[PDB]
Amino acid sequence: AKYTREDIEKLVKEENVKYIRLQFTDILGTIKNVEIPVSQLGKALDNKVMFDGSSIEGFVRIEESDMYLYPDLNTFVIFPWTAEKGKVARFICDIYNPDGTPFEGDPRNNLKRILKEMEDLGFSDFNLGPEPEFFLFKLDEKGEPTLELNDKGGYFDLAPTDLGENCRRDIVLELEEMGFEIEASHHEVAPGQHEIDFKYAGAVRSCDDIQTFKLVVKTIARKHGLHATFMPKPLFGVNGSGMHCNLSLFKNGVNAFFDENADLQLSETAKHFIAGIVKHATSFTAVTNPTVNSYKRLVPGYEAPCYVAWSAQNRSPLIRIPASRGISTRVEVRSVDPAANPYLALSVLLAAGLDGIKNKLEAPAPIDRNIYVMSKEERMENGIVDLPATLAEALEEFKSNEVMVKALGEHLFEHFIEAKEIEWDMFRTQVHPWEREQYMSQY
Amino acid sequence: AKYTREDIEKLVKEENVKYIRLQFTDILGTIKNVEIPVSQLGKALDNKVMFDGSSIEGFVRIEESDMYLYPDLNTFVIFPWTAEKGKVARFICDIYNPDGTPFEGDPRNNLKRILKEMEDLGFSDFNLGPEPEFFLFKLDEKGEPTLELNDKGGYFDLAPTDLGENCRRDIVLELEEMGFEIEASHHEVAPGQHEIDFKYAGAVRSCDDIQTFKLVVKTIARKHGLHATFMPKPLFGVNGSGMHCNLSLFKNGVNAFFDENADLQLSETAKHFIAGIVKHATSFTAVTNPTVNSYKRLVPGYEAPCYVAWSAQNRSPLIRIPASRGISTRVEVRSVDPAANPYLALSVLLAAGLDGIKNKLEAPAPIDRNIYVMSKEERMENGIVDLPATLAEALEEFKSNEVMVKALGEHLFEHFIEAKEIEWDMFRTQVHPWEREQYMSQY
Amino acid sequence: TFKLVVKTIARKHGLHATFMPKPLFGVNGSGMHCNLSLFKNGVNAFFDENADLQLSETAKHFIAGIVKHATSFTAVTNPTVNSYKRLVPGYEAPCYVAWSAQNRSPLIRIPASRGISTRVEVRSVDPAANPYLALSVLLAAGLDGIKNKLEAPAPIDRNIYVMSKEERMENGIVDLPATLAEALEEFKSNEVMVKALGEHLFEHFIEAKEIEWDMFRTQVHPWEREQYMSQY
Amino acid sequence: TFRQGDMSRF
Amino acid sequence: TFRQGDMSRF
Amino acid sequence: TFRQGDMSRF
Amino acid sequence: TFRQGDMSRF
Ligand SMILES: NC(=O)CC[C@H](N)C(=O)O
Ligand SMILES: NC(=O)CC[C@H](N)C(=O)O
Ligand SMILES: NC(=O)CC[C@H](N)C(=O)O
Ligand SMILES: [Mg+2]
Ligand SMILES: [Mg+2]
Ligand SMILES: [Mg+2]
Ligand SMILES: [Mg+2]
Ligand SMILES: [Mg+2]
């Protein structure tokens, strides 16, 4: 462990905190919280604070339900932005039923359940290394986002330079000051697009860090008079934003994906994991790409994946295996976008990987010949299949897959499906300005 | 016949016409023409004027091809808007190959071919009564359409009243002075929406009248400082625009749909026609609803059809049979929208009806119990199926239908499919402002 | 004191704080859900570990008393004209007289926590109500239920909103008053609620609320002009 | 739903 | 209807 | 490429 | 096509 109850009490004592946020994550991935005064810290640490657990369901909630707010001590973080009379600290909390049973509708609890299932298979750790990409948009006088990018930078360019600005540098340093472990940062392909990479860590810790990273990036961008968005494709004709997930499975403290006497230096467990991810790739796309805009990124020509295949060196593969081996052997899933719920996406990815391992599925041959030139029919006879083109198609594929349904349980499944169906129905009946530009004068 | 060559020459002689438009219709339904001086009238009437026949293909044309421009004498019309030094007259012309064979890529020639096939079945005439409806939008200072409607009228309301304005009245009167046979007119359900009904006539004449009606309505609305659009759904949450098609089949000069001694006073031929329309309804939707915006109208709650069923009195049936019987016995197809190509839509409707008649298909039971009451699964067990929800789905349905393919021939089929696939691909990759309003700040 | 302090602090931040039951149409209203717990000899009298739902007979009598007089004290718990624009379906505000442990907008809700924290929540109250008068009428109704040992109706856990008003009137589900005048009429006829505030308070409250309703009903709102000035 | 265009006046 | 405040975000 | 003038309308 | 994000600078 990192913190105990006495450490938390002493720390809030000297730092003089007055406001504590007991934050959690709902279905849609937005950060929710209930706030208590520091005088209620003892009640909070006793797992006694109650709240309306239906808020996890989002806008599809119906009936009020009382649940407990069991906090995690290791997630204690002091926010650097002092709130006038006193500081603000946060806890990331699990959701529990009034009888002490963990709530089945909590994405974090679902991820913990999937990790328990993984431990039942003999493995010890599931490490994740995220590569979240985001755009920076200038704000106007009224303080609302515009469509102007902060810089005309390029891939790995030294575009922001010195002499002020460089919001990426400030974000990286500030995150370092809060205890984050940042690996590297660079300017992304699209103008005004940036990427910050964290060191790999445990799945729960990685998802918590992803949520905190989104919050901190938005806040710091608001400091600099900028708007930071993790929207998959804010602009047409420009590279989208991905959240490539580097997954590594550990057994007895050693990497289970590495085998020095096997071809590609890959163990049989790694091949089974890749086969499991390939089999269910079209099914968990609804969870890893949960928005309507997510599928405008999944178009050819912008390095985003569009077909179910794995490779070591290819143009926009679904699964990429980095050259590094040994302890750093990992499988990268590039379909995930930053808009996805980290807990749900990790749950479905781990469930697919374990399904591949449990059934000893055979991985297909790697693709190293640029399938893009081949026609859709010219590659359908192979193992290459297309990812869903719309959110509705991905929802249809996700409903049919039995394994992916148990990956998040019946409560999460029904509520996610209802919310996404409402979201798609709202989008499909709208009349966009493009239609008026194309048809109002022509017809 | 209505006009001869001598009559045309004499009419142009006294009316002093100097410009002649040899107009025709392409794949997309927009009116095209090649213009000649009056000195070339003799060459035009000799079927000797050449032009680039690839212009029929629209924006997917690849190669120039010489074609002839055989005009139709009965379509001669003198435009009321004088072109300063001389008047303007028009002919609607057929497209012919240089060897004298009619061009297979001409929608009008395709409709004539389908009518010849109908005559091969023993029938004489195929009458169409259209109900085109349109919106009137005010123009701004720069003379471009806005989103403000001309009036806040209602269904059959006396909204425009007297004291000027009343663009519908002026359009009706002007069309009457041009030789049109207007049946009745009224204000439509949506504000700023109007409908004008023609008397039923032959299929070719009806389609020609539809094109001329669109041209005249646009011109007259432009005169009144208004924008007239036949867009299927210009606005969200407001009634759409249809082109309900009243079809009646005649045999030996009498209505073949009428039978006084049968139930509903409907002949067996009428039931076979209804069965044919029902069977192929999901297949010709791509032709009758050829735009992306067409499927935003096909949504529940606005009296537009959404399911394949026929009835005598129901809320938004696909096929409606008016109460009038005898000579006026007809079947109304309400899925068609004004954006559809009249020739292609009539061709596919007639082909489906003849397929029903030729194979003596059995019509399903009429529905009179409000299909909207039950769920989609609660009605799928019956014969009620859903219309395609997007242009891509309708394109997929249309490609698989063997009968509907020959309804317009190989040339028209390939070019229409290519153009519509390009249109859908352009739409699906766009990032609409709705997506930014929904996700730019949320994520 | 909370209302005063909130208004003052919001004024400091350049903001306006209002406890209006429903300041805007089509948007969720503002409630003042009241969690009531009765104690006897320093212990919670609503808790009974050996009974169903872990609820004592005193709690059931209290619930029955609140249910019986619910349509009568609505005039006190919802004393404004705007209060009844909140009491409309679809915004989690109660609209019918029923009690439940888990339902969409019940009049009386019993939280899951038990033992010392056993309580009954009345969700009809809005922040515009007078706290002393609302507490007085709620306590009087609860004591009336306890004193006469009234039998509580069966809890509703099937979403009363599903069926029609005629499809729920045959049960024990009755509708709350739709307007302030209707609530005043219901409140006047309830004898027990009359003593809940005494004759002086009763007469003055009735006079003030009748004047309030009369002023509202004779006004011509802009909605009427938007609906009828051009149509007729 | 089932009726939106007709009641659009309200 | 039956859900308007929660779904008002759309 | 190979078709830019005709497809310029999009 | 097949390369639009990288070549967008031109
Ligand atoms: N060069 C990169 O790796 C960027 C990836 C790309 N932005 C995506 O959305 O996947
Ligand atoms: N009430 C009517 O006939 C109007 C029909 C409706 N506008 C449609 O699009 O079909
Ligand atoms: N979610 C809630 O508890 C809000 C209650 C609601 N605002 C009311 O007026 O009762
Ligand atoms: Mg990157
Ligand atoms: Mg990567
Ligand atoms: Mg009409
Ligand atoms: Mg009609
Ligand atoms: Mg409450």
Author numbering:
A (entry chain Q), B (entry chain R): 2 to 444
C (entry chain C): 213 to 444
D (entry chain b), E (entry chain E), F (entry chain M), G (entry chain a): 1 to 10
The authors write:
In Gram-positive bacteria, nitrogen homeostasis is controlled by an operon encoding glutamine synthetase (GS), a dodecameric machine that assimilates ammonium into glutamine, and the GlnR repressor.
Our negative stain EM studies showed that Bs GlnR binding to FBI-GS induces or stabilizes the formation of a GS tetradecamer. To ascertain if this is a conserved mechanism among FBI-GS-GlnR complexes and to elucidate, in detail, the molecular mechanism by which low G + C Gram-positive FBI-GS proteins bind GlnR, we utilized single-particle cryo-electron microscopy (cryo-EM) and solved high-resolution structures of the Bs (1.96 Å), Lm (2.61 Å), Pp (2.07-2.28 Å), and Sa (2.15 Å) FBI-GS-GlnR C-tail complexes. Notably, the Bs and Lm GS proteins in the complexes were all tetradecameric, while the Pp GS in the complex formed 10% tetradecamers and 90% dodecamers and the GS in the Sa FBI-GS-GlnR structure was all dodecameric. E Density for GlnR peptide and contacts with GS in the Bs FBI-GS-GlnR complex (map contoured at 0.65 σ). These GlnR C-tails all form a distorted helix and bind within the GS active sites. The GlnR C-tails in all but the Lm structure contains a glycine at the N-terminal region of the bound peptide (XG(E/D)XSRF). Arg62´ (Bs numbering) from the D50´ loop interacts with an acidic residue that is generally conserved in GlnR C-tails (XG(E/D)XSRF). The GlnR arginine of this motif makes contact with residues on α15´´ and stacks with the side chain of the aromatic residue in the GS D50´ loop in the Pp, Sa, and Bs structures.
